[PDB]
Ligand binder design. Structure first.
Ligand SMILES: [Zn+2]
Length: 117
């Protein structure tokens, strides 16, 4: 919940969001490919909800979000459960780093997510 100065993603301004997005609820998500209910990521382009990467120390999720990225090339994803009226944790697979999306409000609105949780 804040505490750093992340750079603006080069994809933020021109991020393309597919039509007919699902309505993403404010709680109770699950990776669409496994049983994880924590460390889930919503891809800002197609609205897929998938678990975080597996770290080399064995922690983390089951790599479903990253595997999804390798197939679609959709760069941005926001961590569900980190979205507060002020911001959220946004990750860019392309730039391999946490980033700032100045158009997050709009990008989340696309999924029926009002940043006034
Ligand atoms: Zn998963």
């Amino acid at each position: 919940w804040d505490g750093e100065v992340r750079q603006v993603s080069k994809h933020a301004f021109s991020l393309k969001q597919l039509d007919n997005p699902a309505r993403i609820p404010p709680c109770g998500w699950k990776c669409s490919k496994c049983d994880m209910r924590e460390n889930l990521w919503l891809n800002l382009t197609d609205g897929s909800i998938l678990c975080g990467r597996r770290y080399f120390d064995g922690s983390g999720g089951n790599n479903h979000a990253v595997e999804h990225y390798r197939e679609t090339g959709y760069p941005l994803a926001v961590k569900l459960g980190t979205i507060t009226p002020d911001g959220a944790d946004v990750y860019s697979y392309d730039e391999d780093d946490m980033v700032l999306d100045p158009s997050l409000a709009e990008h989340l609105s696309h999924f029926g997510i009002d940043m006034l949780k």
